[PDB]
Amino acid sequence: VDVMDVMNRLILAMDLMNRDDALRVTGEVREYIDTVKIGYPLVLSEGMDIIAEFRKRFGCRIIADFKVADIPETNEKICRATFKAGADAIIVHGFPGADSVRACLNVAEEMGREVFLLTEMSHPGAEMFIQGAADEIARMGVDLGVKNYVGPSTRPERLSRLREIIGQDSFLISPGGDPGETLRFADAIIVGRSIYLADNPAAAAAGAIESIK
Amino acid sequence: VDVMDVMNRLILAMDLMNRDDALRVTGEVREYIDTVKIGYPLVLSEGMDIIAEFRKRFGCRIIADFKVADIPETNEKICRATFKAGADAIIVHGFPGADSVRACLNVAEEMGREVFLLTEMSHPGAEMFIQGAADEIARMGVDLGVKNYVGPSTRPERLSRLREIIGQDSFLISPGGDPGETLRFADAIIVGRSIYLADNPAAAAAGAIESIK
Secondary structure (H helix, E strand, O other): OOOOOOHHHEEEEEOOOOHHHHHHHHHHHOOOOOEEEEEHHHHHHHOOHHHHHHHHHHOOEEEEEEEEOOOHHHHHHHHHHHHHOOOOEEEEEOOOOHHHHHHHHHHHHHHOOEEEEEOOOOOOOOOOOHHHHHHHHHHHHHHOOOOEEEOOOOOHHHHHHHHHHHOOOOEEEEEOOOHHHHOOOOOEEEEOHHHHOOOOHHHHHHHHHHHHO | OOOOOOHHHEEEEEOOOOHHHHHHHHHHHOOOOOEEEEEHHHHHHHOOHHHHHHHHHHOOEEEEEEEEOOOHHHHHHHHHHHHHOOOOEEEEEOOOOHHHHHHHHHHHHHHOOEEEEEOOOOOOOOOOOHHHHHHHHHHHHHHOOOOEEEOOOOOHHHHHHHHHHHOOOOEEEEEOOOHHHHOOOOOEEEEOHHHHOOOOHHHHHHHHHHHOO
């Protein structure tokens, strides 16, 4: 009850960098998805004012995938600017340590918003430093009372290890490895290209939600 | 000759978040400083168009302190958007691994710009994961032909270790933490509040440059 409800357990990764395209696609799928993740490529290209535009046009929740990774004072300012622009939640790296995460939690508490802790990634290169730190980063989050987590699904069983550390109550989102395996552990899956590059995004979203069931 | 020349070895960390203040202060010090570092608090608050404004008003070099820390494809897009906006260089985390760094190097090569690898940080919390990875991150940079590095100066002797790994030819910038011994290892020092919160920023900059001797 204390974590967000994501409609149909499906989050749109809106990774297009053009405002017209981003708004067009998002409008086509709003019947199916109430939660949209946007990142720096779009906001740097079009301005942070685009966040309020998504919310005012569509009434969707916005998660700012900004992978915040600075010192505490700077993290605080990034979070404040992002929440002031209307973001409901922000994604934060754990690798820079507990004080950097707490800075974000502080601003979220002040402003009534949410922090997601990114515990692990699974692109090539993640094996160098990230994967060996993942379990400790997750435990750091739990020890700090973090309730929302982002984890990779390339290895669904790792998603299980994460779920093991954070408990069943925490909110966990992940890209949608096989969605069937992923949804055993994640509360919602994140879907990008298969929807936003589709000839018919509405139909794509509708089909994804059916399979989720 | 193949790395940048920073006028007076002094980089302004322009961490103010409103455009009027940022432009006022930068204008006061441009006689002394030709290189300005801008981060997310300012650009998210005022728009990426502010980068071109600094360059057109002041003819300064801009380093975008964006601590890029995503997967390769997203890193590529962040770098492209940032360079398109006019940034001369971008600061990139090494913790996400070699492919994520190479994505940035690829765009920089294409566009004729520069990547700075952030090897280490020294805020509280950096001891958890960052400090133990620092030497390996620096070696990863060297192995990838990275020429520009950012390192912390809270422990000047750590700057010596970094300088040891990257060689004498690489370009190294660091905050200025006694400037005296930081400059034994770093090619330029980064100064923020001492200048931008000063009643007389011009005098503050002038004094700093004199101290650098």
